[PDB]
Amino acid sequence: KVFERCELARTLKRLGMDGYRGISLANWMCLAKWESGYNTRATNYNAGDRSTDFGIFQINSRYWCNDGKTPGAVNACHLSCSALLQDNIADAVACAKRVVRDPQGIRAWVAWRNRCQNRDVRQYVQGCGV
Numbered sequence: 001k002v003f004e005r006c007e008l009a010r011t012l013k014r015l016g017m018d019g020y021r022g023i024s025l026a027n028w029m030c031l032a033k034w035e036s037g038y039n040t041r042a043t044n045y046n047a048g049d050r051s052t053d054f055g056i057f058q059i060n061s062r063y064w065c066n067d068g069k070t071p072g073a074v075n076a077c078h079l080s081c082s083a084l085l086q087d088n089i090a091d092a093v094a095c096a097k098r099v100v101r102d103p104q105g106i107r108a109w110v111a112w113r114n115r116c117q118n119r120d121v122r123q124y125v126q127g128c129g130v
Ligand SMILES: [Cl-]
Pocket: 078, 079, 080, 083
């Protein structure tokens, strides 16, 4: 599923993402925008280390979900990576919450540092009623 901007904003708020571990909703929106373009079925194989990024938040198989083919991988979200390719983003949000519960927080995603950190991210939630 490819979410429309405001549709996703309202959905994440309902799932309790606004202010989770100090992270505002607009930051989550900025992250989803740059990671997958709000696309739940986006997949990206990282040839360099044999891992794959899955779904709307592009969560990595080396630490967060199990796809069975990633060398030396753990499954912290205790989910099959398939769960992060569904149209319903409930499991993906629960896993994103687990990621930021680690010391790095939102910084775990390099794309956030490049495109969201220290930026005016208000544009991502403007006019959405959230
Ligand atoms: Cl699962």
